Amino acid sequence: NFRRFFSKFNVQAPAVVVLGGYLPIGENQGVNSTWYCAGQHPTASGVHGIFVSHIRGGHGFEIGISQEPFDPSGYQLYLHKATNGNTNATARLRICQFPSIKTLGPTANNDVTIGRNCLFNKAIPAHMSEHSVVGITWDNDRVTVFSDKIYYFYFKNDWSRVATKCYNSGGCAMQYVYEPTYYMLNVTSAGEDGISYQPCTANCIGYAANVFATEPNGHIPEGFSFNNWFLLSNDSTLVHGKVVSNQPLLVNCLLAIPKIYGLGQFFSFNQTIDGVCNGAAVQRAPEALRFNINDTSVILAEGSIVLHTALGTNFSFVCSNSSNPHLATFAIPLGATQVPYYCFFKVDTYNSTVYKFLAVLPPTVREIVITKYGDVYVNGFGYLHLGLLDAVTINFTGHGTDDDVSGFWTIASTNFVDALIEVQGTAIQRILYCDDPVSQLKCSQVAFDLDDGFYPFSSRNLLSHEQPISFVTLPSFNAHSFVNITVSASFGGHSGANLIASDTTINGFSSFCVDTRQFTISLSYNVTNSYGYVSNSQDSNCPFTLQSVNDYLSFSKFCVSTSLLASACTIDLFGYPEFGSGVKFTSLYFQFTKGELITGTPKPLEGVTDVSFMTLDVCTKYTIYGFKGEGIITLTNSSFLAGVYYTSDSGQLLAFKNVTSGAVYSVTPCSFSEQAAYVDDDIVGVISSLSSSTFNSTRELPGFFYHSNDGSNCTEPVLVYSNIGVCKSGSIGYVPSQSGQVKIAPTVTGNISIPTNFSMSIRTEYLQLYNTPVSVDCATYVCNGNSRCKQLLTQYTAACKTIESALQLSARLESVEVNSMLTISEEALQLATISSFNGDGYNFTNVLGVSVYDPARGRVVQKRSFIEDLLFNKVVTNGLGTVDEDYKRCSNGRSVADLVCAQYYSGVMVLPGVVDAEKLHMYSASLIGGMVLGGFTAAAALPFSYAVQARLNYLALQTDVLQRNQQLLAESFNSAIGNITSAFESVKEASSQTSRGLNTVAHALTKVQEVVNSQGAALTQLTVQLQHNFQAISSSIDDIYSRLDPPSADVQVDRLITGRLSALNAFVAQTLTKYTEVQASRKLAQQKVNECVKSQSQRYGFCGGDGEHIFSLVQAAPQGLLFLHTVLVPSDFVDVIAIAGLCVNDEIALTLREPGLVLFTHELQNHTATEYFVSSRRMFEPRKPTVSDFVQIESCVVTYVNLTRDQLPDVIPDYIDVNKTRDE
Ligand SMILES: *[C@@H]1O[C@H](CO)[C@@H](O[C@@H]2O[C@H](CO)[C@@H](O[C@@H]3O[C@H](CO[C@H]4O[C@H](CO)[C@@H](O)[C@H](O)[C@@H]4O)[C@@H](O)[C@H](O[C@H]4O[C@H](CO)[C@@H](O)[C@H](O)[C@@H]4O)[C@@H]3O)[C@H](O)[C@H]2NC(C)=O)[C@H](O)[C@H]1NC(C)=O
Ligand SMILES: *[C@@H]1O[C@H](CO[C@@H]2O[C@@H](C)[C@@H](O)[C@@H](O)[C@@H]2O)[C@@H](O[C@@H]2O[C@H](CO)[C@@H](O[C@@H]3O[C@H](CO)[C@@H](O)[C@H](O)[C@@H]3O)[C@H](O)[C@H]2NC(C)=O)[C@H](O)[C@H]1NC(C)=O
Ligand SMILES: *[C@@H]1O[C@H](CO)[C@@H](O[C@@H]2O[C@H](CO)[C@@H](O[C@@H]3O[C@H](CO)[C@@H](O)[C@H](O)[C@@H]3O)[C@H](O)[C@H]2NC(C)=O)[C@H](O)[C@H]1NC(C)=O
């Protein structure tokens, strides 16, 4: 049955869900089964769960669970109900240090006494329905019981050994479970019905929406819900947008755990975490670990989170409703999510125990995340920080037992990575890792999809920085000095025991001070004794001696004095004559202050120079003659003589000269700019200045290198740039000069080729007509509504006023121009629908839009055409133009502002477009109906074939209007229209867009995309400027006025006022450029529609390029018109001999009146019968000549054909020989 058992996992009726854990293994499917249903007592080891499925009224039931080591100290379990009283027969249950019953019995053969120690020795009612299933599972010291509810109990245990006694119940009474299993619930109704449980394989684990299969590279697989995966911040959370941020999303191992189980686990930031990873595990030590949980009740237990620091300090996670652990108890007396819970960290160390306040716990904790460097986030916020973590222990307590295992609560080991994240409604929906060079380029911009084009790129530098340090500078000459000392003493006198005189000097002076870095002392000994010699000895009462100082003694100041000297240590000298007078010389003093300015040296080193050092041809940091930088130093073989360092005219260092050797070394950048040809959502080639890169082929273009994976010629350039083009396959090549359509130069004689076999092609061209008007509330944009800032802005006079006036004047001028342009005729509109139109042979179903009764306020509306549908839906990012938000609700303030209201709060209001797509399509339909309207009334609806025939006759008089002649043009036009429609439908498929370039569909759609993106880009660029702090103390005016005094604050806010005003002016200037450019576009469009659509043009090449223009039809397009100029292209040429004229009887010269008419001889009778035909030079329409087409000239010329009077009527059938007729 099992319906009642699975009904306990309370789940919503219409939800299909996945079950995991030690569940019943069924009866028939898989190995599983093993339903005993007998008193055979199978003793088993290593079992993790047991189940009983059918209670045949009241049959008995005996269970004994014990440790396999049979430990008497450990706790055993024995449950026994050998009674059939149902409700009144409560089962005797004992979780105790209990008799370890080996086989069977209430007491039985065993160890341990009955009641030496018990945790539970009461009786429990064990009555239930026949189909009710009871089960008990033990794992990780946690026990789950299925007695009508998912009861959970933490209990240290090791319960591998089981012994049983069953009683017969339907052949499926009792069974064991060794390993976890999985199930699928097709729940369709509440209660025990509408459950439809089935067993599962591993795939069902992947079915849960909150778990995923980790990629081998660690990337998050696509399509993940990210239902609770918040982005991690310290300060504030973005509500909507895209962010390139460093977040711990590089997942290594994912541990999906069913909600009904708690968890006792140990995690180390230094070792790969254990457990069965769902996807491809990566053996990398975690630096962050993220817990995704449904309900808060898991964490409320004290000690659930224990953080271990490298210092050994422990942080225990505690919660209560109280804010004073030191002044109150935290044993929880309340539950059921009542009252917000203050949650702290208690610090555990045997010096002083303190509590660190985490936060008021939010009502719904969904993900916690702890990470090394000492950081913890709850619901993606930086609540608290600590020192370097090294280990965590997780002690989690199941779930709320009211909606369980509708999936799995999951723990993820993650490493930090720079990723692009798209977030809406403060919830992540998609992510992109910034490791692939293609992904690196994507993250360089801010977008997930990138249009085809050449993008700037940085040359890949060294993976390991390890940059050596370079330093070049010629130093000063190492000046030396000799500090003389000379003592002059004439002693002895009489008998040698007397004195005569004594004196001493340093450098001929009574005092001296050392200046050079290197000094050497030298002492000299005038002692002249009248009796003989004198022994001289040196005393010392200083931390140094005259002999010691020379070695390496260093000072900041050193002065020698023969007399009193400030702060000077004393040194004396003794002179003993031959009989020992024993008198000192003059006392000597050193004033010394320690320092590196000077140093005592035993020998001078004059000539010693140079301390520079550098590394050649290695990307290194350098300090060259005061220029600090980072680059590559390379010995260059130039021969500069003057100068020591060389810089460009812009002040940039280029080369420096080793003065000692004369060599010169150039300094180049470590990395060079490159171009990536991002087409077809891939990097197909790189234009680089380097010799080689990570591509299979490299081609040496005249100006640069091109590295790609396709060395073949690029005959079909998908993306053209400068002098080159790149195909979709990565090939590069020069664009071949396409040969234009040949035009026959008119002439009077010789051969002439007349075009024929005309094929009716169509060429497309898009022309923008208007831009969306934008009003900028300058005052509130700059001052953010601050009155003081407005008063300061008043000092800037009329810049703001001019900005606003220019914007509004441009908007009004554009509006009035486009409004006066659009003229719509209702009679033409009547003929503009499929039912009214009769395009015999011409297939306008793609061009005409259907018109049906609109339930929206009754008024009838005409749906836009299929071509217009394709052009709008697939291009417009919002799908429809009505998506333009209204500011009516923007000031409501009851909801969090979106992007439109975000920019409106800055004073930017985007007025609706001047003309909606509905009116534009109406105008296009009016033009289409007008080109077939043959009169002032609707009854004059000329068939399109007649109109085409008239327009053809306009440029060349048709001589034989064959039905097949018109049918060929009709079918060619239909084929071209179908091809254009297919090209619009999709890119490079079902219509090969290999034929690409100007005047094609692809160019038009690229222009439309650029048009629809430019305005949004400009608006976002304007809005982001508010974030910038323009060299002020902050980007908030109120913050500046708070932290600063009024004097300095005015100076400070004046900095951003100029910055915002300058940024605002830049936006206005670029919009005026856009307005000026589009103005010329609509002037061309107005000229185009008048001279091409409403009437055929004699201006060759004006309407849709070269060729003979027959007509042109307009379709609506985003902020513009798409002209389809239909043009005739010749397919064959008839070669004829032009007749310059006739000279008949050598006396009458007769020529053709019409300059655009040629007289010739063709076909079999060009020379056999010498028959003449006149035809238009534009189209081959041979016709017999007429007397009205000829004029007489006063003189013949040699180029004219000889003729006689009798022969002329053969040439001219309409001629009447008046002399012959009158004389007969
Ligand atoms: C919320 O606010 C907290 C407050 O600190 C921020 O916590 C900091 O997080 C950053 C990482 O985001 C920590 O920086 C890490 O330092 C590690 C050790 O530092 C040494 O190495 C760096 C780099 O050589 C030296 O500059 C530094 O002086 C030390 O010598 C680094 O090894 C880490 O590098 C890792 O990331 C880089 C990418 O940036 C990889 O290339 C590396 O291979 C490596 O995987 C890292 O930079 C910082 O220590 C944390 N603060 C403190 C006080 O410890 C949170 O980041 C912030 N939240 C968000 C979302 O930003
Ligand atoms: C999960 O459950 C839904 C709900 O259907 C219910 O559960 C099933 C297990 C069956 O017991 C159903 O009888 C029960 O109502 C399943 O949706 C059901 O799918 C089946 C086919 O897979 C649908 O049958 C089809 O119905 C159409 C329209 O009547 C017929 O033309 C077909 O020939 C075929 O009979 C059934 O209509 C549909 N239930 C409803 C209410 O529309 C679902 O398949 C199942 N599994 C999953 C993965 O969702
Ligand atoms: C993991 O969390 C669980 C539950 O939060 C912890 O189990 C709990 O441990 C405390 C500490 O002894 C127990 O308190 C004691 O309860 C008994 C009654 O059973 C009482 O007589 C004692 O005076 C004392 O208050 C608590 O009962 C116990 N909870 C359960 C359900 O058994 C466990 O210690 C935590 N483990 C780690 C490693 O943090």
Ligand SMILES: *[C@@H]1O[C@H](CO)[C@@H](O[C@@H]2O[C@H](CO)[C@@H](O[C@@H]3O[C@H](CO)[C@@H](O)[C@H](O)[C@@H]3O)[C@H](O)[C@H]2NC(C)=O)[C@H](O)[C@H]1NC(C)=O
């Ligand atoms: C755990 O996840 C579940 C969803 O997987 C969420 O709780 C459940 O939310 C639904 C819809 O809000 C509740 O449905 C209805 O709730 C009432 C409450 O009395 C119930 O009586 C109705 O029959 C109906 O099922 C569902 O009860 C609820 N589950 C609970 C409360 O256990 C939520 O994301 C998480 N639940 C908690 C308590 O955090």
Ligand SMILES: *[C@@H]1O[C@H](CO)[C@@H](O[C@@H]2O[C@H](CO)[C@@H](O[C@@H]3O[C@H](CO)[C@@H](O)[C@H](O)[C@@H]3O)[C@H](O)[C@H]2NC(C)=O)[C@H](O)[C@H]1NC(C)=O
């Ligand atoms: C700039 O040019 C000068 C001039 O060549 C370079 O000086 C050179 O420096 C090296 C390293 O000190 C000298 O090598 C010598 O080796 C012998 C044997 O080990 C040792 O006894 C010397 O004391 C010295 O180290 C080399 O002779 C010397 N060249 C000379 C003196 O002409 C210098 O390295 C260049 N680069 C700079 C300054 O960055």
Ligand SMILES: *[C@@H]1O[C@H](CO)[C@@H](O[C@@H]2O[C@H](CO)[C@@H](O[C@@H]3O[C@H](CO)[C@@H](O)[C@H](O)[C@@H]3O)[C@H](O)[C@H]2NC(C)=O)[C@H](O)[C@H]1NC(C)=O
């Ligand atoms: C176009 O104009 C040229 C000259 O103005 C016409 O000349 C034709 O040229 C072809 C090619 O040489 C001649 O065919 C062969 O000529 C050679 C040399 O004269 C000779 O062996 C044969 O007579 C042979 O047919 C052709 O005779 C010559 N015809 C005339 C009237 O000059 C040419 O007819 C004009 N039309 C076309 C379609 O080229």
Ligand SMILES: *[C@@H]1O[C@H](CO[C@@H]2O[C@@H](C)[C@@H](O)[C@@H](O)[C@@H]2O)[C@@H](O[C@@H]2O[C@H](CO)[C@@H](O)[C@H](O)[C@H]2NC(C)=O)[C@H](O)[C@H]1NC(C)=O
């Ligand atoms: C057409 O006639 C002109 C006029 O010349 C007269 O008619 C000729 C049929 C012949 O009888 C001439 O003697 C007549 O004077 C021709 O022009 C002459 O062409 C030749 C050919 O080389 C030339 O030598 C003469 O100078 C031309 N006479 C002029 C220019 O007065 C012409 O050749 C005749 N044929 C064609 C096809 O035009």
Ligand SMILES: *[C@@H]1O[C@H](CO)[C@@H](O[C@@H]2O[C@H](CO)[C@@H](O)[C@H](O)[C@H]2NC(C)=O)[C@H](O)[C@H]1NC(C)=O
């Ligand atoms: C801080 O926590 C660590 C746990 O990581 C404690 O180390 C434990 O000490 C007990 C001593 O009774 C040992 O039985 C455990 O084996 C130790 N744990 C580990 C993982 O080895 C440490 O004593 C705690 N210190 C303080 C001051 O609370």
Ligand SMILES: *[C@@H]1O[C@H](CO)[C@@H](O[C@@H]2O[C@H](CO)[C@@H](O)[C@H](O)[C@H]2NC(C)=O)[C@H](O)[C@H]1NC(C)=O
């Ligand atoms: C007094 O100072 C002079 C000045 O240098 C010292 O003379 C030097 O003596 C050394 C020792 O041989 C010579 O190598 C130098 O060439 C001498 N230099 C000069 C400029 O003469 C002298 O030694 C010091 N002492 C006395 C007693 O004169």
Ligand SMILES: *[C@@H]1O[C@H](CO)[C@@H](O[C@@H]2O[C@H](CO)[C@@H](O)[C@H](O)[C@H]2NC(C)=O)[C@H](O)[C@H]1NC(C)=O
């Ligand atoms: C050029 O680069 C490609 C890219 O791997 C190398 O092989 C290509 O492999 C794909 C996939 O098997 C094939 O479809 C292509 O036909 C292969 N060639 C090309 C040019 O893409 C190739 O080994 C590289 N080196 C060369 C062609 O010399």
Ligand SMILES: *[C@@H]1O[C@H](CO)[C@@H](O[C@@H]2O[C@H](CO)[C@@H](O)[C@H](O)[C@H]2NC(C)=O)[C@H](O)[C@H]1NC(C)=O
């Ligand atoms: C393909 O691209 C190459 C590279 O520019 C072109 O180079 C030609 O190579 C041939 C073979 O030696 C030379 O004879 C030509 O002089 C080269 N021309 C140029 C402009 O470089 C080549 O023309 C292109 N087309 C083909 C079919 O190889």
Ligand SMILES: *[C@@H]1O[C@H](CO)[C@@H](O[C@@H]2O[C@H](CO)[C@@H](O)[C@H](O)[C@H]2NC(C)=O)[C@H](O)[C@H]1NC(C)=O
């Ligand atoms: C005329 O052009 C229309 C285009 O609207 C063609 O009609 C569509 O043909 C496709 C063929 O795959 C059908 O799937 C559509 O249901 C047709 N109707 C539409 C798109 O409205 C038509 O085949 C062309 N030729 C005619 C009418 O002779």
Ligand SMILES: *[C@@H]1O[C@H](CO[C@@H]2O[C@@H](C)[C@@H](O)[C@@H](O)[C@@H]2O)[C@@H](O)[C@H](O)[C@H]1NC(C)=O
């Ligand atoms: C801490 O880790 C050191 C580095 O060894 C490896 O570290 C990470 C990257 C894992 O791959 C881990 O399995 C390796 O051991 C060890 O040298 C050091 O012994 C480790 N310290 C402790 C206490 O385990």
Ligand SMILES: *[C@@H]1O[C@H](CO[C@@H]2O[C@@H](C)[C@@H](O)[C@@H](O)[C@@H]2O)[C@@H](O)[C@H](O)[C@H]1NC(C)=O
């Ligand atoms: C925290 O929650 C307590 C709820 O428990 C109830 O009150 C205690 C005193 C016991 O009597 C217990 O049996 C009750 O169910 C509140 O009483 C307590 O005031 C709360 N703490 C604070 C600071 O408000």
Ligand SMILES: *[C@@H]1O[C@H](CO)[C@@H](O)[C@H](O)[C@H]1NC(C)=O
């Ligand atoms: C259980 O036994 C008592 C004693 O005879 C009796 O009164 C009671 O009705 C019984 N309960 C059931 C459910 O049979």
Ligand SMILES: *[C@@H]1O[C@H](CO)[C@@H](O)[C@H](O)[C@H]1NC(C)=O
């Ligand atoms: C207590 O502080 C002293 C400070 O010298 C330190 O040496 C000692 O290890 C600390 N004791 C503990 C248990 O942290």
Ligand SMILES: *[C@@H]1O[C@H](CO)[C@@H](O)[C@H](O)[C@H]1NC(C)=O
């Ligand atoms: C000391 O030596 C100096 C060296 O110049 C000499 O001139 C002088 O006569 C000597 N005797 C005395 C007493 O100075």
Ligand SMILES: *[C@@H]1O[C@H](CO)[C@@H](O)[C@H](O)[C@H]1NC(C)=O
């Ligand atoms: C010095 O000149 C030679 C001339 O053959 C040249 O090959 C060499 O590259 C030059 N040195 C450097 C560093 O370029």
Ligand SMILES: *[C@@H]1O[C@H](CO)[C@@H](O)[C@H](O)[C@H]1NC(C)=O
């Ligand atoms: C094309 O022109 C040739 C001669 O110029 C003619 O014979 C043919 O009928 C025309 N049409 C087609 C379809 O070839």
